[PDB]
Amino acid sequence: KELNDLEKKYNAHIGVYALDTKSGKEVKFNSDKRFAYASTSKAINSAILLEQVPYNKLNKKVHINKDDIVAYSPILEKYVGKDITLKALIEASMTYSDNTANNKIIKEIGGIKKVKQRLKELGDKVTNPVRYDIELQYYSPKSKKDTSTPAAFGKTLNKLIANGKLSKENKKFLLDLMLNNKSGDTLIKDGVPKDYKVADKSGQAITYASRNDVAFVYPKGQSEPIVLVIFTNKDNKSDKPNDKLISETAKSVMKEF
Numbered sequence: 001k002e003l004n005d006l007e008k009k010y011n012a013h014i015g016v017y018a019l020d021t022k023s024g025k026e027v028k029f030n031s032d033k034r035f036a037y038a039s040t041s042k043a044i045n046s047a048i049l050l051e052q053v054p055y056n057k058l059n060k061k062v063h064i065n066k067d068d069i070v071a072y073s074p075i076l077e078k079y080v081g082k083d084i085t086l087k088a089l090i091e092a093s094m095t096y097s098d099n100t101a102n103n104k105i106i107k108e109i110g111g112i113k114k115v116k117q118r119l120k121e122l123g124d125k126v127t128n129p130v131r132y133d134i135e136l137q138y139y140s141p142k143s144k145k146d147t148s149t150p151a152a153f154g155k156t157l158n159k160l161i162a163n164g165k166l167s168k169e170n171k172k173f174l175l176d177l178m179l180n181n182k183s184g185d186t187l188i189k190d191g192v193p194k195d196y197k198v199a200d201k202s203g204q205a206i207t208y209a210s211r212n213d214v215a216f217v218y219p220k221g222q223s224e225p226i227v228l229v230i231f232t233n234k235d236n237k238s239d240k241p242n243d244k245l246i247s248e249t250a251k252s253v254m255k256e257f
């Protein structure tokens with residue numbers, strides 16, 4: 001309804017899935033439509049690693065070489081020939097959307113093929129990781145590669161983080177990164193009521209103005225999060241997104257709760 005209106009105001013396509021984990025209440029709009037998840041996949045990879053490595057053991061270091069470095073790695077770019085702890089990899093991936101950190105997290109997990117296995121165990125047969133960064137960012141409406149539906153992606157985010165194989169410490173370390181992430185400030189954070197806490201991970205693919213934001217939103221007073229997945233995109237390959245679209249979509253969706 002009003003989301004269709006926002007699709008008209010911004011000449012864009014909105015994908016929404018939101019789940020209040022307390023009530024089990026869901027808001028869906030183009031929720032079974034495929035979108036490039038882009039960097040929002042970093043939250044998923046980070047959480048999967050965290051299921052396998054206890055907080056105390058995030059101090060394990062791993063070697064970084066030139067072959068590991070991919071574009072848009074503001075943190076990892078300085079670790080060629082150096083060691084980095086898994087904790088700092090996760091921090092890089094989440095806070096700076098470091099692409100090299102995210103690939104190394106997927107490697108730690110055991111590779112794309114293992115992320116796929118985990119996804120399927122969580123009943124997610126939609127989220128479709130195929131490539132590492134940055135190649136996963138070359139979205140095409142014609143390919144399913146590195147795409148998901150807001151519903152499949154949110155359900156996974158809910159089963160992985162919102163409840164709940166993560167220890168209290170690993171769950172806190174991930175969510176704090178997401179809460180403290182100043183790079184998602186123009187998205188969901190921008191549209192939610194100022195007293196709501198928002199723990200997000202944003203994404204922007206190279207093509208079709210694919211701009212996304214996923215978050216754990218805590219309406220003031222509630223501790224149970226509302227999982228919010230907003231995927232947007234446009235008709236043209238070189239289209240530039242408008243973050244206000246996501247900000248407005250989040251505002252609208254939050255009234256439903």
Ligand SMILES: *C(=O)[C@@H](NC(=O)Cc1ccccc1)[C@@H]1N[C@@H](C(=O)O)C(C)(C)S1
Pocket residue numbers: 038039040072096097099133134137202203204205206
């Ligand atoms: C996650 O979505 C990452 N996206 C890319 O690596 C592709 C890309 C898209 C637009 C500009 C540059 C690179 C990260 N998200 C972007 C972004 O927010 O635009 C980063 C440049 C932070 S990498």
